[PDB]
Each structure stands twice: as structure tokens, then as C-alpha cells.
Design a protein around this ligand. Structure first.
Ligand SMILES: Cc1nc(C#N)c(N)o1
Length: 165
């Protein structure tokens, strides 16, 4: 199962890891993708997860969008986890660089409560432009299920752990 995680709360764990390598190792039931409403997995966590699936995640996602239309900011959909997980929960956190409402971050984390255990990144962090310290706070105050957070950046991981209240 999940190894080397630091326990933050009753249900939130954190590790300095590449979520792709973590998913390939653990093969979790659910890996969370830091998705956008169009499921265009170009960069950040989404680009990395999609590249690990040899673009199969993008092909599946394009068919999903053709059928259903775009997701809402704060929403999610469950698709295949391909070679990374049983399922991928594509969750859209607000993108601060596109001027989206940061208050939607709690709605985005609420999607995690539909899954007993997840491997996930910090929503709206990285190229989505939100403060990762704030994202971790919203995560711990919103998610009640077991969430294993993978933080790619070592310096950010250290800052997150050392400043955790
Ligand atoms: C290549 C890569 N970039 C990230 C991020 N963020 C990741 N998980 O893997």
C-alpha cells in the first residue's frame, strides 16, 4: 500500500513524490487528476498523468467531453485510471491564473468524499496558481475520506509540513 507518508490528520497523509511514480508503484483504486473543465491534459499533474498513459487518458477524455460537454469548475468525473490506477477522478479546482473563484476550491475537494481512499495532488496548486498552503488547509478541513497527497516539489513539501497548523 502507501508508504513513506507523513500523517497530518486522522485522514490526511502527505509525501514528497511524483504522483505518476506513486500511482505506478501503488496502483491505487483512485488517482486524482488536477483537471481543467475541458479535460485537456496539457501540463502540470494532468500533462504528466496523461503522458504516463501514452495519451490514452486524453483519448478517453475527448470522447467524454464530446458526449457530456465540459465539467464545471469545482466538479469532477470518474474515468479510467489506465495503467496508473483503477479509476482517475478528474477534479477541476479553480485556476487563479484564469481568474476563477478561489472559493470553489472547497467544492472541488468535496468530490474526494465520494471515494474511501485516494492518491491526490493539492488542488489548484502549481500551474493553477493558488497558494498550496491554503489548498492543504482546505483539503484537511473538507476531505473526510483517506487522502494521500503527493507533492512533487521537495522545497514546497518542506514548507507545507513545517507550516502545517
Ligand atoms: C513531470 C511532472 N510534473 C509533475 C507536476 N506537478 C508531475 N507529477 O510529474
Amino acid at each position: 500500500s502507501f508508504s513513506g507518508y507523513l500523517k497530518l490528520t486522522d485522514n490526511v497523509y502527505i509525501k514528497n513524490a511524483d504522483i505518476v511514480e506513486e500511482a505506478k508503484k501503488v496502483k491505487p483504486t483512485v488517482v486524482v487528476n488536477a483537471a481543467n473543465v475541458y479535460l485537456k491534459h496539457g501540463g502540470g499533474v494532468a500533462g504528466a498523468l496523461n503522458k504516463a498513459t501514452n495519451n490514452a487518458m486524453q483519448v478517453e477524455s475527448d470522447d467524454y467531453i464530446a458526449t457530456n460537454g465540459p465539467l464545471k469548475v469545482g466538479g469532477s468525473c470518474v474515468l479510467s485510471g489506465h495503467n496508473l490506477a483503477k479509476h482517475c477522478l478528474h477534479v477541476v479546482g479553480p485556476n487563479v491564473n484564469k481568474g476563477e473563484d478561489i472559493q470553489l476550491l472547497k467544492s472541488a475537494y468535496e468530490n474526494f468524499n465520494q471515494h474511501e481512499v485516494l492518491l491526490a495532488p493539492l488542488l489548484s496548486a502549481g500551474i493553477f496558481g493558488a497558494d498550496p498552503i491554503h489548498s492543504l488547509r482546505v483539503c484537511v478541513d473538507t476531505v473526510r475520506t483517506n487522502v494521500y497527497l503527493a507533492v512533487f516539489d521537495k522545497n514546497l513539501y518542506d514548507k507545507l509540513v513545517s507550516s502545517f497548523l
